[PDB]
Amino acid sequence: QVQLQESGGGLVQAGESLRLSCAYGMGWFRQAPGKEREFVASIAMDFVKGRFTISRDNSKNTLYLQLNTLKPEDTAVYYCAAAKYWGQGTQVTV
Amino acid sequence: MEDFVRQCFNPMIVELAEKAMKEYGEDLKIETNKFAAICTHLEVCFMYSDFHFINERGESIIVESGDPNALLKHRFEIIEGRDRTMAWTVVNSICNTTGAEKPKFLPDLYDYKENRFIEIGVTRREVHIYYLEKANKIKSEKTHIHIFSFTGEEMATKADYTLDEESRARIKTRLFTIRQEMASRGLWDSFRQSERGEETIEERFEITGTMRRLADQSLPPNFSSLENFRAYVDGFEPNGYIEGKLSQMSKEVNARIEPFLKTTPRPLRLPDGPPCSQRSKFLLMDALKLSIEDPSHEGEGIPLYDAIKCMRTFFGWKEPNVVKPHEKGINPNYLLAWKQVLAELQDIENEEKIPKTKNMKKTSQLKWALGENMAPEKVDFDDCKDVSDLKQYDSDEPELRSLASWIQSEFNKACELTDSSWIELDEIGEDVAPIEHIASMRRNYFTAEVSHCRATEYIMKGVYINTALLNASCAAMDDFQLIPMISKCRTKEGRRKTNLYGFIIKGRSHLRNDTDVVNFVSMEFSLTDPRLEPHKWEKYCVLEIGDMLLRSAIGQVSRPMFLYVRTNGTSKIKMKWGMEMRRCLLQSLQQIESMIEAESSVKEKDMTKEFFENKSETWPIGESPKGVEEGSIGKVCRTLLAKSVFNSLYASPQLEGFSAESRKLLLIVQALRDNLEPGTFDLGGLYEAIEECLINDPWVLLNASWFNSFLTHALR
Amino acid sequence: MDVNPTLLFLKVPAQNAISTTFPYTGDPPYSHGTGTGYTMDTVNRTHQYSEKGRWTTNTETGAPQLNPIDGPLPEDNEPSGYAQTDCVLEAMAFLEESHPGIFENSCLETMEVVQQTRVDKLTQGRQTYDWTLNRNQPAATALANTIEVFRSNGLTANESGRLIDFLKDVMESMDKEEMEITTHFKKKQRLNKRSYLIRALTLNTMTKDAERGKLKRRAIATPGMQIRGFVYFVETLARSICEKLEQSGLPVGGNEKKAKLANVVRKMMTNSQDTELSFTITGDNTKWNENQNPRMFLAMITYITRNQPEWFRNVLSIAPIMFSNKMARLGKGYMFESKSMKLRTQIPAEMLASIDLKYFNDSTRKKIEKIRPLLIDGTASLSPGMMMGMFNMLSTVLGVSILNLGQKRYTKTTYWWDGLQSSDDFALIVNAPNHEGIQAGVDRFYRTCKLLGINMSKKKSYINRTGTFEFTSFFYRYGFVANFSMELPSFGVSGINESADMSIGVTVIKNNMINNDLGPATAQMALQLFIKDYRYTYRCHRGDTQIQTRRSFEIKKLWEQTRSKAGLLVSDGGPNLYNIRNLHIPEVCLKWELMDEDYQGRLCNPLNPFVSHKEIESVNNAVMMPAHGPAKNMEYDAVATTHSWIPKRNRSILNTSQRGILEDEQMYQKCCNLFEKFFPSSSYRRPVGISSMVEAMVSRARIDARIDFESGRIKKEEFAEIMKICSTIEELRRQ
Amino acid sequence: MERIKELRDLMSQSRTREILTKTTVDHMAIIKKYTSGRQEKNPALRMKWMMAMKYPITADKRIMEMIPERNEQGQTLWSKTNDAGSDRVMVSPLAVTWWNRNGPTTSAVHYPKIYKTYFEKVERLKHGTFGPVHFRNQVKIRRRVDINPGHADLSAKEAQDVIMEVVFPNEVGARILTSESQLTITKEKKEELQDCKISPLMVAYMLERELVRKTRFLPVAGGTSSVYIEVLHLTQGTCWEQMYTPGGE
RNA sequence: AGUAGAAACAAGGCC
RNA sequence: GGCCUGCU
């Protein structure tokens, strides 16, 4: 019943910014190539706190993740999730 | 089943049983057999009590109908059929009057012959069990118990049956009527056992209707119902949410501490403008005294005669003329008022006995001087709306005025000694304890120090003037009244003396609110020429009324002698607070005694005598161009007394605000001087808070100048 | 040489002579006219400190309400009412964790009290806003009027005599289509649902007088009678909670406050080692009441009452629900003057919604323009925050939660803090190994305070090293120092009556000697001055003097008649035997052995027509509003003499349309006196029950006539006469 | 006789009849406190303002039939104009002093028995013995102490039933006091005050004061005894201690 | 005019 | 001119 599509990923510079968007409580999770899932934010983890901000528009039915001051260690597929329902993920490469 | 109690029983009993039903708060629709059972109990109580009378003998007189007479005494008087409070009232009253024992449960009747209670109960079950049941319910009971049961049997302890047997035949006929009438009804499927002693209830406080919707509109922004918010609260647990918002909150939200150093505090800025004027209700530094040297005490005597006698002691009267005009009023009115006062004083002098209080004529002169018929007439808004000039009352910050040097000199001479004792204290219980002797000696020392002080004279002047003004306002509300300013002192030689500063004319004083203003006009003799400090007398009109000759080595001066005349006003609150000026003595001398006690806690001995005689120790109590000047403890006493007196005289909201906001800065400066690393979050805000209290009051501006001087001398 | 008292501080420390800085010997500032301007200013200020919230319109009252909760976090140090629900819930959770069992217990005792409380407890209160007349009236009068209106409308559950039932009726009244009220000018007027809702949710605004310590006047509020029961229950819960918190100082007296302050400072400094520095902040909170949102109090109470009976939660939640929708009456109005035509006018505040703005100055014009959108039926919606410290105890609870949130277990850093909070004032002792640690600790404390809608007044606050600070006019300098300038206004005649004034004055001198370190000689001087003022106020001079007054003749003849003149009371023109050793003895008992038996009997005669006693509460209790504090009551020792008269009443009701209230007063008092003669314990213990007057009175007449015959004066003739007279009044009550 | 007679007279008039009928016992207190008189905010100001009027105090109507309307010179003692919301009449303060020089006299021998606390204070102080004053810093520490020196080890409610049974024996209701200390107190204060006619309310109030224990927090240095706390103002100071021994010891 | 200071008094109402 | 009120 809950389909999810992520937008806003891509190739960025280190120290740059990026606004992920995903069209119930909700979460942003990430998966690096060599690992399983990592908690990012819900509506933040130690590795992303202060850099990253999660925010939702319940009228637009969308959850956003505003990433700033990015590091090469953010490089992952960022998946959106609803709580059982998981997006396909959007690639972010820093 | 309730149809039976609809049909048979009389109204009286059914509503008695209904109120007994309401008594313990259970509802009649759920279980009614209790209603029927207890109403039958109540019916047997009546039918057993009524129709039974007594006369002066025992041997109750039984009459089917009470005949008209004083002989209507009832054999058995009922307990039940009443509320619990009254049932226990009757129980206690019977016990206290009959000298009997108090039962712990409710009886049903009282009887005289045997002087005791009856607890009637007719139960469905047979008697010979219910009897001893209720008997073991009641502890060690002398009240006789008697019960019937439907089969028709009777029983009792002592084999005692207290009245006629035809009455009991009546009871059991009633009983079987009940029985074989339910026979037609058919209730025994539950009649024998229908009550088991149920007592339980749940308190219900339900939010519903409009009040529920209000609850749905008093939640955080993203909640829809009180149910959901309460569920969220119950499910809420701490998961480090304060830390997240603290990290996300902007860092400009801080409480950075600004160090407070010697170079940090700046002098308080004083307002600039026209010089400050005089606000007191009487002359303080420029007063003159006409005396008689009478032996009367402060309150002893009659005012008008004393004033006239004092004024006759002076010779050299001249026709009064204007010297310094009011600059805003009609000085000829003041001149005519002075001459009118003199004329009416003579008029009193002529007649038989000086009146205790005199009323003056309401001439146009004092009508203007006292502000009569000047309040705008009160009307309705619907009748005055097109008037362009119609607007609010003038509500703005007071006029700004700069400090002048006259208040400083006035305070300087308010702390100086005098040639008289201006305090005659009352009596106290003879001292019995050594501590009381120490207290009395200390008090005598302070009285010797402060009695010869201009501050005490001002205290007495204000107290007397305000007392007389308040009493006249409360008594002679309508008519203008004359009151001579009188103060009685004692000379160094010991001879008592009276002093007449001048006169006060009180006007209409229909004072309703504590802020309503009573206007009066004050006239006071003086020798100080007003041509040297005119800005201090902005609101005064000063005439020339005579010449005075005081013995001096330079021939004899033959100085002029002027009359300061002005229109002033007060209020009930101001009069009341000015008539309690004697607590300035308290304030000051409590401070000095605290100093003495604090110093004496160091050296294990009372230190008052050496403080007051040796005068070795001194405190900074003023600054001279050479530097800071220190004075003995007595001078500190007088200085603090003068400060308190001026606080009571020039009281105003400015004084309170400045006092608070400057005590804050004084504490900060003291912390700095104590090496306690003081710090401030916004010192500019505190400075702006202090500086907004300084507008036009001479006293607060002088206090601010003193504070600036203290800062300059401190911080070193 | 120029005299300057302030220079005295160069030798005497500031706190050792702080009494000199308290000008409490002059008249305190008073307000003169309307308080409407202050009310409008307060409403606008409360609404603009929360401007960034969200607006809504209540569907019941139709008034605009502003909700700032969970709003944007502040980005400046200005006052802000944007409290965060999660943060405050977490603070309350930590408060519970540090004090396990606090909420459950406090709720248990509160539940006991609520389910055993009576209606009459609401009469024990000062002025309350009666909505039946739209004006402030004594609590008992307003309660009686509301009960009468409810009974006339059909809400008679309050007849159960329970406050909970009265509140049930109050809530049920909210769902009525049309209520009826009475007005005299009697006219019966009908109030629809919305009008009655607004009349029950409104507050009456007045100007506070006799307020020392500030240049500007303020406004205060008084609620109605429908909401006072819920407030009573909520404050009972909050008091029970705070009594279990040592960091709170609101439910205690002054000496307890000083003791707790000393204990906390010693604990903080002593435990601190040589390496840790300690600093005390003497903090005041700016706009304390205007920034406390009732919704947050609702959240706190619903967290407190978790796992409790739902009815208890509902009854405790009703109060903040009504405060969140509270309305405020603008005030008396505005008075205009026209000098050209020489007249004055008084427009009521209710016209501010429609009256043109040509009559108002720029400041008032702008205030009215800003407050008009919130005007609904002559009253302004004040949802964003509290008006004047109605929830003092809950605010203290929030402050104590903030204080406890830095117990070094939640700080997670070397620095830590503690202190004492009493609403609008606090002392904060913060310790940290270095000045940087102290700065970080104070910064985090301030930031956390801003997350709870609490602001710290930077202008009225300062930080120094521990050992010197201030708290509610109590100056601590290595130990509290007496002031004696706060109690100076209480050294005069109280104004109750002669005996009461004498006893109160001597007792005040005694107490200020015990507590405020008043000196012996100073106390003797105070006694002398008080006796002088007392004699000059009551026209009771020594008698041997020639001071002619309205009372000097009778006093002088009594003086010449008495043989042992040393036993005469000062009220009757006798000598004063009081001294430092006799300050704890009533005057009558101190002079008992010296009085002549004739004068003694005439003085203390029960049949005197002057002594009047109403209830056990008002026997020897005097309400003296202390300077710089809330109204307080004192027990004064006095003997019931002929001097214990009660003074004249106002008597201005005779010129008002509300003149029938005096006839009702007289009739009620006649009935009450009759009942008391029938029920002597009516005064000491208030009677309880559900019966009516005449039933109890007639039935007790029956029984008392009976028994007083069985031994006493009555006779058969009289007993039968009483019995048939009881029957006569019975049949009269029938018809 | 009389009581039921004014009852019938009240019920004669319709308004008072309605008040008596519809008003329940529980509401007794409310209507008794029902008044238009506001509680004074500034009592001192008006006491200093009212005493300057003629007829500033209030007294029962009976004063009109015990005290003459005027004294020897014609100064009026009482007026027939009733108070605002009461049947009492406004009278002058002289009517007080007059009552103390020619008013009816009684036997005040039992007032010492009633006002037990105050007379016990006087007796304790009269036989006290003072001592030298020692000047040294006093470390005043704040402690909770009992001020009432005659408390019989009873609380407010605990002694309230005792007080009712002593004064109002019939309105006690269910309660019959179990503790034997209360029994002896009731017996003593019953036989002692058997015919005292001061007032039931004042007797009850003073019994409550005497028997009920009361406690307050005060700055003390030494002492700590009930008898030594009533004179705490005289024995302890800022820098001086006055040795004292009340008459009881 | 005067008192006083963010609004008032300098009598009110009723005939 | 006569009378009423002074916290309503």
Author numbering:
A (entry chain F): 1 to 23, 32 to 51, 60 to 99, 112 to 122
B (entry chain A): 1 to 716
C (entry chain B): 1 to 185, 207 to 756
D (entry chain C): 1 to 249
Q: Can you list sentences taken from the study reporting this PDB entry?
A:
Central to the replication cycle of influenza viruses is the viral RNA-dependent RNA polymerase which transcribes and replicates the viral RNA genome. The influenza virus RNA-dependent RNA polymerase is a heterotrimeric multifunctional machine composed of polymerase basic 1 (PB1), polymerase basic 2 (PB2) and polymerase acidic (PA) subunits, that catalyzes both primer-independent replication (vRNA to complementary RNA (cRNA) and cRNA to vRNA synthesis) and primer-dependent transcription (vRNA to mRNA synthesis) in the nucleus of infected cells. PB1 houses the polymerase active site, whereas PB2 and PA contain, respectively, cap-binding and endonuclease domains required for transcription initiation by cap-snatching. High-resolution structures of the complete viral polymerase from a number of human, avian and bat influenza A viruses, as well as influenza B, C, and D viruses have been determined.
A panel of 24 nanobodies (Nb8189-Nb8212) was generated against recombinantly expressed and purified polymerase of an H5N1 influenza A virus. Using cryo-EM we determined the structure of 17 polymerase-nanobody complexes at resolutions between 4.5 and 6.7 Å; this is sufficient resolution to accurately position each nanobody bound to the polymerase heterotrimer. On the PA linker (site 2), that links the N-terminal PA endonuclease domain and the PA C-terminal domain and wraps around PB1, we observe three nanobodies; Nb8202 and Nb8210 bind identically at residues 220–240 and Nb8204 binds at residues 250–265. Nb8210, used as a negative control, had only a minor or no effect on viral growth.
